RNA sequence: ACGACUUUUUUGCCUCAGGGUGCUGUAAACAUGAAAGUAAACUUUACGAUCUGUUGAGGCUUAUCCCUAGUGGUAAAGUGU
RNA sequence: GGGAUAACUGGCUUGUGGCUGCCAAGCGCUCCUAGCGACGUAGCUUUUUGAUCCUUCGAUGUCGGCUCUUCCUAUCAUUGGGACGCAGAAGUCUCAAAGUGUCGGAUUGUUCACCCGCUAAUAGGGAACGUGAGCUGGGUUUAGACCGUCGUGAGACAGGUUAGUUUUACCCUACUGAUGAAUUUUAUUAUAUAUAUACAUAUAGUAUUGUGACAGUAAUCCAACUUGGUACGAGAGGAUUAGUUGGUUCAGACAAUUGGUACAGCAAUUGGUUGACAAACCAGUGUUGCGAAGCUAAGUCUGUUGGAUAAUGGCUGAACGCCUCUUAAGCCAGAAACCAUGCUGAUUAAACAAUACUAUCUUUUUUGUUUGCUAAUGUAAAAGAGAAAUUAUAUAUGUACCGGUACAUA
């Protein structure tokens, strides 16, 4: 079996879970979860969000 | 003069009056037919809704728009303990329909059982069944006799096991099940054989059958009329209100006419469901049963945190293609088809390809609470 | 050639106005009526990316004003679930105009189109930059 | 709606608690930490939005979520036949 | 004061309108009738307009729209057919058909109308001109006002235009849903081991399982492609039919997924307030962001096949040597129609069966039934209430041989 994966999130996404944005210029976006998706839409930089794993990252904290 | 533009009426005539059903548990109104040549056999099955799911599922069939790709597909899950068969029925069809001629009782049954012929089965002395049960077996034989010469149906009286789910209730349902196949003699014969022994779901159905689901629908009390019947709001400035229909019929004749909906009950009603594909038929031994040839991971059917007001299921399973009338924890009813299904859906094959076992308690992110503390890593 | 579009969610109901989104000159699209629409009560009839409709011209060149004039839908932001089990939704909608037998007025799609669309058309999808 | 219906009445059930599952988004607290600068000592002492560390933390999660022979509970005894 | 008398329905009639006939002079290349049909002539209808003034003036709320349901058929589409001036295709006329459907708009107060567009088709009607204690109030039909014409004037106008209160259900019924006792002048499809038995059976109480009379009833249409660039056709064009894959419209559910939703809950924050910090509160929900659970659609699933037929095509076959679908007797295939099947209800049958367990209880005999009570009587049918073959009807029944034959028998 395998996953697909996350843009704004880095979790793992089974089948027939999330939703996919498709940008202007041809970029897709899957976002895990309804909350990921008004998050990103209104533009916030994921490693600027404490609880989301793109600041863990930045932060020297994994 | 005629109404100006024309539409169908709201809501089928079929179902009135749309009140609420007599009984929780469901009731076949009619059996499939009995074809004489084909063995002595079950056909209905009782179980519990535990929830839905979704399923994910490689499609065969050729010149579809969809075709080769594997699919995503809603599915419910129904609990099934074993039935426990406590007594036999022979019917006999006279011009003012069926009548019973005599009924035959195993040697025991169980207090789960017992419980269902009381209101207070604490308050009480527990005294129903025992004397009658004794009666020696002589007695049992002539009673069978006589309706093994007579009789033209005979149907099988079969039992939850109410404590081998997670369910309040430990008074049983019982539901008479008809049995179809060869002559008088085998089919006694074998409810005779089966009788206070235990009943699984693999002896009455097989793999990629298509069965029909009798259940009650979800209760909401008295609904208005535009919700219980699909009626256009009215305009906004309207004087007495605008969630009600403008008129209930002619002057004449000079009656209001039944056609014509009103406010009332909505839901609790009986439905019969026709031709829902299995996709799998669980075993309760196995640790694999929600696993898959592309999965190839350990996991039980109960979702991840348990399903919404039912938990664990722990016994046998039924994964069934779509949706089933009903609530949560409430009883369910397998039929089988009417008639024997011939369609390109009837014969094919499902080899399924993933089941979800993630949350149904908000947006689920893992299969296991395994891969979840995997996942994160050390915590308080 | 084939027409078994599949049931993808209904968006656009009429009056609707889209991006034009080709070198036809046309700027935008103003949808009129839907091909194919049922007949039913005082349901607006309405479109979906499969669908051809009958639009005119708002703004654009003024020979492509006036007139009525077939489209395709080719973008469209009312999500819609795809059968391999997500739900897609582009940033804005968009059309482009047609030959009533579908034959494409200009030589680019400039957007990207919706696969659902391509496969449809195929004298559409040959123009198209991205299928998506 | 009220009736009614569905239940249970000690291998239960209610009750909290623990665990599970999520939901939120990183608590208070402390630092001779960081921080735009600022001011005042004969390098040290003041103020300081905010930020970092201890901190995927803290809080909440059945009232119509899940599990637990875990805790403590479990009255009235009426009335009709 | 008036229904002695108008403006509104209904009623009679049906001139008027609408619809259908019959004739056959012609039209239809030739050709009365494929399609027509003058000159004429007979009806029907009450969706029109009249004529009328029977009913209502101690008030039947006066147009239209919205919504909603049912009925009709003089059929528009869909189904099945027949005819053709029918090669296919397109189509016209026509018969069974009322099952199922019959739309988005622009403009108008509009019935009406006209476009534009979709369409499978945008059929025609009824129900107090269906629908005002359902709404709406734009129009017409109060008081104010304007302009014209008309009037010396007050003022007039089937001329235009503008501002102009829409009341009451808690009654009875109806209908939709919700409970619910009572039910002996009453029932009854058996009981009993090739024989019995209504002149008999049936207490009651809970409860469960069913029975299922009877009542209700639902699915619908399209596209695309294969059949086939074939049949047919001079070419151009160009199918029915199956079949395959999809969708529409409706119905019935459902919430895994997606979306919607917030006085579950966390967080953020403006203004004030508790000395500050912390905790908070308050702004009729302070305002935001996310937001479980539950509802929910714009999201998901699911929506049979027999019997008997109509129209019609046939078959055997006389009447009438022949012929003849029967315009005789006998038959057959055949439709979205009809009835089942299916599905819903079934205190719609004051209906009913089986089963589990239970409350002095049962039998015979005797005498009686001439504080509200604490012994107690009613008959729609007693006077010998007598009678289980079974099948025809222009023949039956036994019996014997093997429905035929023979012989009896009513």
């Given at each position: 079996?395998?996953?697909?994966?996350?843009?704004?999130?880095?979790?793992?996404?089974?089948?027939?879970?999330?939703?996919?944005?498709?940008?202007?210029?041809?970029?897709?976006?899957?976002?895990?979860?309804?909350?990921?998706?008004?998050?990103?839409?209104?533009?916030?930089?994921?490693?600027?969000?404490?609880?989301?794993?793109?600041?863990?990252?930045?932060?020297?904290?994994? | 003069?005629?109404?100006?533009?024309?539409?169908?009426?709201?809501?089928?005539?079929?179902?009135?009056?749309?009140?609420?059903?007599?009984?929780?548990?469901?009731?076949?109104?009619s059996?499939?037919?009995?074809?004489?040549?084909?063995?002595?056999?079950?056909?209905?099955?009782?179980?519990?809704?535990?929830?839905?799911?979704?399923?994910?599922?490689?499609?065969?069939?050729?010149?579809?728009?969809?075709?080769?790709?594997?699919?995503?597909?809603?599915?419910?899950?129904?609990?099934?303990?074993?039935?426990?068969?406590?007594?036999?029925?022979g019917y006999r069809e006279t011009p003012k329909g069926l009548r019973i001629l005599?009924?035959?009782?195993?040697?025991?049954?169980?207090?789960?059982?017992?419980?269902?012929?009381?209101?207070?089965?604490?308050?009480?002395?527990?005294?129903?069944?025992?004397?009658?049960?004794?009666?020696?077996?002589?007695?049992?034989?002539?009673?069978?006799?006589?309706?093994?010469?007579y009789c033209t149906v005979?149907?099988?009286?079969?039992?939850?096991?109410?404590?081998?789910?997670?369910?309040?209730?430990?008074?049983?349902?019982?539901?008479?099940?008809?049995?179809?196949?060869?002559?008088?003699?085998?089919?006694?014969?074998?409810?005779?054989?089966?009788?206070?022994?235990?009943?699984?779901?693999?002896?009455?159905?097989?793999?990629?059958?298509?069965?029909?689901?009798?259940?009650?629908?979800?209760?909401?009390?008295?609904?208005?009329?535009?919700?219980?019947?699909?009626?256009?709001?009215?305009?906004?400035?309207?004087?007495?209100?605008?969630?009600?229909?403008?008129?209930?019929?002619?002057?004449?004749?000079?009656?209001?006419?039944?056609?014509?909906?009103?406010?009332?009950?909505?839901?609790?009603?009986?439905?019969?469901?026709?031709?829902?594909?299995?996709?799998?038929?669980?075993?309760?031994?196995?640790?694999?049963?929600?696993?898959?040839?592309?999965?190839?991971?350990?996991?039980?059917?109960?979702?991840?945190?348990?399903?919404?007001?039912?938990?664990?299921?722990?016994?046998?399973?039924?994964?069934?293609?779509?949706?089933?009338?009903?609530?949560?924890?409430?009883?369910?009813?397998?039929?089988?088809?009417?008639?024997?299904?011939?369609?390109?859906?009837?014969?094919?094959?499902?080899?399924?390809?993933?089941?979800?076992?993630?949350?149904?308690?908000?947006?689920?992110?893992?299969?296991?609470?395994?891969?979840?503390?995997?996942?994160?890593?050390?915590?308080? | 050639?084939?027409?078994?579009?599949?049931?993808?969610?209904?968006?656009?109901?009429?009056?609707?106005?889209?991006?034009?989104?080709?070198?036809?000159?046309?700027?935008?699209?103003?949808?009129?009526?839907?091909?194919?629409?049922?007949?039913?009560?005082?349901?607006?009839?309405?479109?979906?990316?499969?669908?051809?409709?009958?639009?005119?011209?708002?703004?654009?060149?003024?020979?492509?004003?006036?007139?009525?004039?077939?489209?395709?839908?080719?973008?469209?932001?009312?999500?819609?679930?795809?059968?391999?089990?997500?739900?897609?939704?582009?940033?804005?909608?968009?059309?482009?105009?047609?030959?009533?037998?579908?034959?494409?007025?200009?030589?680019?799609?400039?957007?990207?189109?919706?696969?659902?669309?391509?496969?449809?058309?195929?004298?559409?999808?040959?123009?198209?930059?991205?299928?998506?």
């Amino acid at each position: 079996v395998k996953t697909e994966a996350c843009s704004f999130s880095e979790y793992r996404i089974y089948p027939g879970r999330g939703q996919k944005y498709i940008a202007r210029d041809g970029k897709v976006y899957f976002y895990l979860s309804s909350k990921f998706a008004s998050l990103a839409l209104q533009k916030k930089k994921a490693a600027k969000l404490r609880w989301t794993q793109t600041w863990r990252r930045n932060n020297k904290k994994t | 003069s005629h109404r100006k533009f024309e539409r169908p009426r709201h809501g089928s005539l079929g179902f009135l009056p749309r009140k609420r059903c007599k009984r929780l548990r469901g009731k076949i109104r009619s059996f499939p037919k009995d074809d004489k040549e084909k063995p002595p056999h079950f056909t209905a099955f009782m179980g519990y809704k535990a929830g839905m799911t979704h399923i994910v599922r490689e499609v065969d069939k050729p010149g579809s728009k969809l075709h080769k790709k594997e699919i995503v597909e809603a599915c419910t899950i129904i609990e099934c303990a074993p039935m426990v068969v406590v007594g036999i029925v022979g019917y006999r069809e006279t011009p003012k329909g069926l009548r019973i001629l005599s009924t035959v009782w195993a040697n025991h049954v169980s207090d789960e059982f017992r419980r269902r012929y009381y209101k207070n089965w604490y308050k009480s002395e527990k005294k129903a069944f025992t004397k009658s049960l004794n009666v020696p077996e002589a007695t049992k034989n002539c009673l069978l006799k006589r309706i093994e010469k007579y009789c033209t149906v005979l149907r099988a009286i079969c039992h939850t096991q109410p404590s081998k789910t997670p369910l309040r209730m430990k008074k049983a349902h019982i539901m008479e099940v008809q049995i179809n196949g060869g002559s008088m003699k085998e089919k006694l014969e074998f409810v005779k054989e089966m009788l206070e022994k235990n009943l699984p779901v693999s002896t009455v159905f097989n793999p990629n059958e298509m069965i029909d689901v009798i259940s009650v629908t979800k209760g909401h009390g008295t609904k208005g009329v535009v919700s219980r019947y699909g009626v256009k709001r009215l305009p906004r400035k309207t004087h007495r209100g605008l969630r009600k229909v403008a008129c209930i019929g002619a002057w004449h004749p000079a009656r209001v006419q039944f056609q014509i909906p009103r406010h009332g009950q909505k839901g609790y009603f009986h439905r019969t469901e026709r031709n829902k594909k299995i996709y799998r038929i669980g075993l309760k031994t196995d640790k694999n049963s929600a696993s898959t040839d592309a999965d190839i991971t350990e996991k039980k059917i109960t979702p991840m945190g348990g399903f919404p007001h039912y938990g664990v299921v722990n016994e046998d399973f039924l994964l069934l293609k779509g949706c089933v009338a009903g609530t949560k924890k409430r009883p369910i009813t397998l039929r089988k088809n009417i008639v024997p299904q011939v369609s390109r859906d009837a014969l094919a094959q499902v080899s399924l390809k993933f089941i979800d076992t993630s949350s149904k308690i908000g947006h689920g992110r893992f299969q296991t609470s395994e891969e979840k503390v995997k996942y994160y890593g050390p915590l308080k | 050639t084939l027409k078994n579009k599949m049931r993808i969610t209904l968006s656009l109901p009429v009056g609707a106005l889209i991006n034009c989104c080709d070198n036809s000159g046309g700027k935008n699209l103003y949808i009129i009526a839907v091909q194919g629409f049922g007949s039913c009560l005082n349901r607006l009839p309405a479109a979906s990316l499969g669908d051809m409709v009958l639009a005119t011209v708002k703004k654009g060149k003024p020979d492509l004003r006036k007139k009525v004039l077939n489209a395709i839908i080719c973008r469209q932001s009312k999500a819609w679930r795809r059968h391999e089990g997500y739900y897609i939704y582009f940033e804005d909608n968009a059309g482009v105009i047609v030959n009533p037998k579908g034959e494409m007025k200009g030589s680019a799609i400039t957007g990207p189109v919706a696969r659902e669309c391509a496969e449809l058309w195929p004298k559409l999808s040959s123009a198209a930059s991205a299928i998506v």
